[PDB]
Design a binder for this molecule. Structure first.
Ligand SMILES: *[C@@H]1O[C@H](CO)[C@@H](O[C@@H]2O[C@H](CO)[C@@H](O)[C@H](O)[C@H]2NC(C)=O)[C@H](O)[C@H]1NC(C)=O
Ligand SMILES: *[C@@H]1O[C@H](CO)[C@@H](O)[C@H](O)[C@H]1NC(C)=O
Ligand SMILES: *[C@@H]1O[C@H](CO)[C@@H](O)[C@H](O)[C@H]1NC(C)=O
Ligand SMILES: *[C@@H]1O[C@H](CO)[C@@H](O)[C@H](O)[C@H]1NC(C)=O
Ligand SMILES: *[C@@H]1O[C@H](CO)[C@@H](O)[C@H](O)[C@H]1NC(C)=O
Ligand SMILES: *[C@@H]1O[C@H](CO)[C@@H](O)[C@H](O)[C@H]1NC(C)=O
Ligand SMILES: *[C@@H]1O[C@H](CO)[C@@H](O)[C@H](O)[C@H]1NC(C)=O
Ligand SMILES: *[C@@H]1O[C@H](CO)[C@@H](O)[C@H](O)[C@H]1NC(C)=O
Ligand SMILES: *[C@@H]1O[C@H](CO)[C@@H](O)[C@H](O)[C@H]1NC(C)=O
Ligand SMILES: *[C@@H]1O[C@H](CO)[C@@H](O)[C@H](O)[C@H]1NC(C)=O
Lengths: 136, 195, 99, 122, 50, 296, 110, 50, 49
């Protein structure tokens, strides 16, 4: 952004600061907040089971411990922010879901054709939905 | 564990300043009170506004701080004929490394320093004794005469109360809509038996 | 229909616990601790908060009533066609050739 | 507090075998790890213990060299490795939990594992 | 016989209609003579009284 | 006066797991059959709690572990103790503990419970000496060394006189005392509950709700705290006052509170039976947001 | 082993049988405690008495033991059918031996 | 439908620019400028408007 | 060209009237005020209000 000379800071349509200038080196910066509160959880009924999987909405699986600051949280939050069963899709990042190549009828919808269900050694699986039986 | 007749204090002319925040002064005798606490000290008179909650100042930050949810009353009156004589016994704190928490005191007399000087009990460069006295004289004008301040703090309906107003307990009536009063808790309705 | 009505009714009841910035959420507490020269500045915050909750509840009830109105009109149309006669329409009176 | 060990193994003489022990339900670095063997139809023998903090083993008499004690704190699983297996090494090996009290250990083995059966035969 | 009403039940509901009535549960306190209670009742602690 | 303690085995402490402990009543308002959210200082679920021991084992050398160290005092602490001979006799709270800033003292010297907030010149190693004679079977205490001076004081509280057993029980721990200390607006709020238990050598697994015990308007600045312990002297411990002693088996746990969100469950009897930590795991966080302990 | 145990004991159901144990001045005479373990056939050993007098949680009141200087003993009161197992004693000897277990004693219930 | 959704979202974003009688439309300036006793008075108006 | 802390003016006892509206006195030094106008006069003691 060509900051003509003494024009220092910036704001968006919602008057929140998006650009600013360092008062010492006169360099130009861009501003993007970092809070995150949009978490989603895919779980079966409590009368059925107690296993729980969590979807991280619209965030990459490689940037989870920085956006949520998991290292300053409980280890239970850390183990659900970094684990073996970590999957990235169009909807976001899933941690705890067991990705499989099979296709079944949708049980718990997530988005972008991704559905989860409880499968037996019981665990929460994640799979692409099936439109139906192939026919000709 | 008493009955507090508040109608002998605010109606009297002995106090030149009387205001309350959590309750109205006229509605003090119809409520029951839990854990009433009384604080008392002497004020030069021109900083009595700092005793009010949510106010900045020397006495508020470093001598006596009130919380923002302070439910109580502050009582102030002139005491020039009683405390002044050049009375140097009434001291107050000027400096501290941090602002005081609400409802706390600091009687430490360590030597304050305002830089990199490692003063150890010596009033060196920018090293000061943290306490000074007013020096109340009878010839002092308004704003410098000594003012005795009494602060009351308490809780409301948090527990079975021990302090109550000077109101007699009437006979209990039931099965008709009446204005009840249970230790300061008022309302209207039929009071039904229950087990 | 049962659960949304129960949830909205419980949300209406639980909204009285909010003080909306006042000293207390109990009307009798303000009336017993304050005088009308200075109690009315605390009452109207509870008036505005509770009235706005009542506006929100009735608005949601009106939207839900329109949804039931669409379903009841569909149910009356299905009753007047599938029950009172035979419908040539496809997949209206169930899947397949309706009898 | 569970002490899950590995399954049973059948090994030839002169070979090497590794035995793992999973611990859970407790702070693994707070309690010392102990290993106790038992020949079939015989008494229990204590071949030593290994600290969970520093990982230094402390073998008993006759178990030096052939027996290796090791662990790692990522999974918190103790390891028992035996080299140059002979016929007299056929025994069940048990894991024992002992609180880390200091340089002098107590005599309280509160929890024991299910045991690991190893048989050396041709 | 499953859909027609029967004279055995006091109500005119059929067997299918009786199953439909029993399969509906309320998360709130039900509408059954609720002002017969909440008056002279010791156990006045429920959702429909409040 | 003051005497230092010798022949002790100085060792670093250990850690253990606190299974949903430290939950206390946030207010004195009766609730029943309702889930109530709250915003207050609490012990987070499955947190690391520091382990301390006061155990002198038998043998030639043994391990004379007698740990009463100075520990930091955060915005809130959680204290739990398993006792069989009433070894823990209270705590001390303050900032410097050297008669430069005033400090408070909570000591139970058998007969009375003493609460004093004075300018205490605290000892380097405070302890309480209990003597066991052999001419008869008395278990009196004759040593009281907690502080050096009590020059300036501003608060004082003495409870009614009573008696306790002071007996050297040989069995396992049978009394579990849990404490929660807070310092908000000069009010030293204490939450406590005495619960019988039958364990051996660990913090028990379970849930408990601590009732409010007493509120102390003190108004002092507290940054550090230390725990008082008892001491046994008899004919089996020869030497001077610094070495002729034995510990007597006892243990306690020290944990730190944290500003958290809790979902509290009240039963039909009006007692807290379960709690949900809203910042522990996404399952309990969803339970906290949905305000349901169950979820379809 | 340094700790010496009787080979086997027998007794009727319901009466009292006492199992003895002897050591030396370096294991029991040195002041170290003696622990006792019960091992059912095919299962892991289970300690029933620690610190010479104390029963852990869940242990029935029929089990009791004591020590007297160099020797130590354990007492069984009210024998039943489920007590048919092998009992093992252990303690702490000096540093040349460390932990020393007993010889084992099979208890017979007639 | 697309234009209506875009217009509604743009209006929702643009409504944050209104101060609703406060000294400023951004909460950070009020927090960094005022003590909490009057900051809460500003936050009441801002919260009500939003 | 100010590096001057704003707290030193009102912790002294040399003042009599000091009440601020736009910026709270507790965080005057935490904000940079670009430029500051300094106006002064002498009036009677009853005309301060
Ligand atoms: C117990 O030992 C400690 C040292 O570990 C003694 O501590 C004194 O500490 C003050 C400041 O904390 C020093 O100025 C003194 O010089 C220390 N004393 C000595 C002798 O070095 C403590 O005094 C000892 N207790 C007793 C009763 O002597
Ligand atoms: C401020 O000082 C730094 C350090 O010398 C220098 O790099 C920078 O260019 C200076 N900025 C201005 C605007 O003078
Ligand atoms: C709940 O679980 C029980 C068994 O634990 C089962 O019998 C019952 O049918 C389940 N209820 C539902 C609604 O699935
Ligand atoms: C699933 O398919 C991927 C390629 O799309 C393959 O790499 C992977 O091995 C497959 N997994 C299974 C279990 O078949
Ligand atoms: C407890 O400490 C261990 C290491 O000492 C650490 O891995 C763990 O995350 C800690 N847990 C908590 C709740 O602080
Ligand atoms: C145990 O005590 C004896 C006698 O004081 C001493 O010789 C020996 O070194 C001690 N043991 C250890 C490990 O220090
Ligand atoms: C006998 O016991 C009493 C109290 O039980 C005690 O005060 C006294 O000192 C004891 N006798 C001796 C000689 O110590
Ligand atoms: C209380 O402290 C003062 C110093 O502020 C001292 O002069 C006085 O002697 C102290 N009181 C007592 C009883 O020692
Ligand atoms: C209490 O004492 C500590 C010790 O340095 C100090 O940092 C702190 O400002 C004091 N006040 C409060 C309220 O913590
Ligand atoms: C509740 O109180 C009743 C009456 O004392 C008692 O019988 C019952 O055991 C208590 N607990 C529960 C869970 O009902």
């Amino acid at each position: 952004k060509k900051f003509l000379p003494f024009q220092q800071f910036g704001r968006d349509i919602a008057d929140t600061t998006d650009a600013v200038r360092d008062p010492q080196t006169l360099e130009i910066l861009d501003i993007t907040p970092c809070s995150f509160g949009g978490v989603s959880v895919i779980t079966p009924g409590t009368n059925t089971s107690n296993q729980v999987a969590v979807l991280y909405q619209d965030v990459n699986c490689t940037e989870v411990p920085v956006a949520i600051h998991a290292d300053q949280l409980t280890p239970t939050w850390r183990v659900y922010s970094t684990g073996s069963n970590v999957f990235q899709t169009r909807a976001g990042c899933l941690i705890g879901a067991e990705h499989v190549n099979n296709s079944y009828e949708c049980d718990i919808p997530i988005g972008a054709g991704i559905c989860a269900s409880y499968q037996t050694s019981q665990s929460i699986i994640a799979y692409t939905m099936s439109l139906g039986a192939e026919n000709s | 564990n008493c009955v507090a007749d508040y109608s002998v204090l605010y109606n009297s002319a002995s106090f030149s300043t009387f205001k309350c925040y959590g309750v109205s002064p006229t509605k003090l005798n119809d409520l029951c009170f839990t854990n009433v606490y009384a604080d008392s000290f002497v004020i030069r008179g021109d900083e009595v506004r700092q005793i009010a909650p949510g106010q900045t100042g020397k006495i508020a930050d470093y001598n006596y701080k009130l919380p923002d949810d302070f439910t109580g009353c502050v009582i102030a009156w002139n005491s020039n004929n009683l405390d002044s004589k050049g009375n140097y016994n009434y001291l107050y704190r000027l400096f501290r490394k941090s602002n005081l928490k609400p409802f706390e005191r600091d009687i430490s007399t360590e030597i304050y320093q305002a830089g990199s000087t490692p003063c150890n009990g010596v009033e060196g460069f920018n090293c000061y004794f943290p306490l000074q006295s007013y020096g109340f004289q009878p010839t002092n004008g308004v704003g410098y005469q000594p003012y005795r301040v009494v602060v009351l703090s308490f809780e409301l309906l948090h527990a079975p109360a021990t302090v109550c107003g000077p109101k007699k307990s009437t006979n209990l009536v039931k099965n008709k809509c009446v204005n009840f009063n249970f230790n300061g808790l008022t309302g209207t309705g039929v009071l039904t038996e229950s087990n | 229909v049962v659960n949304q009505n129960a949830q909205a009714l419980n949300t209406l009841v639980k909204q009285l616990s909010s003080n909306f910035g006042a000293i207390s959420s109990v009307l009798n507490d303000i009336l017993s601790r304050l005088d009308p020269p200075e109690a009315e500045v605390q009452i109207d915050r509870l008036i505005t908060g509770r009235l706005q909750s009542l506006q929100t509840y009735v608005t949601q009830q009106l939207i839900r009533a329109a949804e039931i109105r669409a379903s009841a009109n569909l149910a009356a149309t299905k009753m007047s066609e599938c029950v009172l006669g035979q419908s040539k329409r496809v997949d209206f009176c169930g899947k397949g050739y309706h009898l | 507090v569970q002490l899950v060990q590995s399954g049973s193994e059948l090994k030839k003489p002169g070979a090497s075998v590794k035995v793992s022990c999973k611990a859970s339900g407790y702070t693994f670095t707070s309690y010392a790890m102990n290993w106790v063997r038992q020949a079939p139809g015989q008494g229990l023998e204590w071949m030593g213990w290994i600290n969970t903090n520093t990982g230094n083993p402390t073998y008993a008499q006759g178990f030096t060299g052939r027996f290796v004690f090791s662990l790692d704190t990522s999974v918190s699983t103790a390891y028992l490795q035996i080299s140059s297996l002979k016929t007299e090494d056929t025994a069940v090996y048990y894991c024992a939990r002992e609180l880390w009290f200091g340089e002098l250990l107590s005599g309280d083995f509160d929890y024991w594992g299910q045991g690991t059966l190893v048989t050396v035969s041709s | 016989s499953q859909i027609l009403p029967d004279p055995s039940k006091p109500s005119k509901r059929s067997f299918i209609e009786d199953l439909l009535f029993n399969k509906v549960t309320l998360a709130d306190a039900g509408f059954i003579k609720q002002y017969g209670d909440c008056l002279g009742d010791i156990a006045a602690r429920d959702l429909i009284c409040a | 006066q003051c005497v230092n303690l010798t022949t002790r085995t100085q060792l670093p402490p250990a850690y253990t797991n606190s299974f949903t402990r430290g939950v206390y009543y946030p207010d004195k308002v009766f609730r029943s059959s309702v889930l109530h959210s709250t915003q207050d200082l609490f012990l987070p679920f499955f947190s690391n709690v520091t382990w301390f021991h006061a155990i002198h084992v038998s043998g030639t050398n043994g391990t004379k572990r007698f740990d009463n160290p100075v520990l930091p005092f955060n915005d809130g602490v959680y204290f739990a103790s398993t006792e069989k001979s009433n070894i823990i006799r209270g705590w001390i709270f303050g900032t410097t503990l050297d008669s430069k800033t005033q400090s408070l003292l909570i000591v139970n010297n058998a007969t009375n419970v003493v609460i004093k907030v004075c300018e205490f010149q605290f000892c380097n190693d405070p302890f309480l000496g209990v003597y066991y004679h052999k001419n008869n079977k008395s278990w009196m205490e004759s040593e009281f060394r907690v502080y050096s001076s009590a020059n300036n004081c501003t608060f004082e509280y003495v409870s009614q006189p009573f008696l306790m057993d002071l007996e050297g029980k040989q069995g396992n721990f049978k009394n579990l005392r849990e404490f929660v200390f807070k310092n908000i607006d000069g009010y030293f709020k204490i939450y406590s509950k005495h619960t019988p238990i039958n364990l051996v050598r660990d913090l028990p697994q379970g849930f408990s709700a601590l009732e409010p015990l007493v509120d102390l308007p003190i108004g002092i600045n507290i940054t550090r705290f230390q725990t008082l312990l008892a001491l046994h002297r008899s004919y089996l411990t020869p030497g001077d006052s610094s070495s002729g002693w034995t510990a007597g088996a006892a243990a306690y746990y020290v944990g730190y509170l944290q500003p958290r969100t809790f979902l509290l469950k009240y039963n039909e009897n009006g007692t807290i039976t379960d709690a949900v930590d809203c910042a522990l795991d996404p399952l309990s966080e969803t339970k906290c947001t949905l305000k349901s302990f169950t979820v379809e | 082993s340094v700790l010496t145990q009787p080979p086997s004991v027998s007794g009727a159901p319901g009466q009292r049988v006492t199992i003895s144990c002897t050591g030396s001045s370096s294991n029991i005479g040195a002041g170290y405690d003696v622990h006792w373990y019960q091992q059912l056939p095919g299962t892991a050993p289970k300690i029933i008495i620690y610190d010479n007098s104390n029963r852990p949680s869940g242990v029935p009141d029929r089990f009791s033991g004591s020590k007297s200087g160099t020797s130590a003993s354990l007492a069984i009161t009210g024998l039943q059918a489920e007590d048919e197992a092998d009992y093992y004693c252990q303690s702490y000897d000096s540093s040349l031996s460390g932990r020393v277990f007993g010889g084992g004693t099979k208890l017979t219930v007639l």
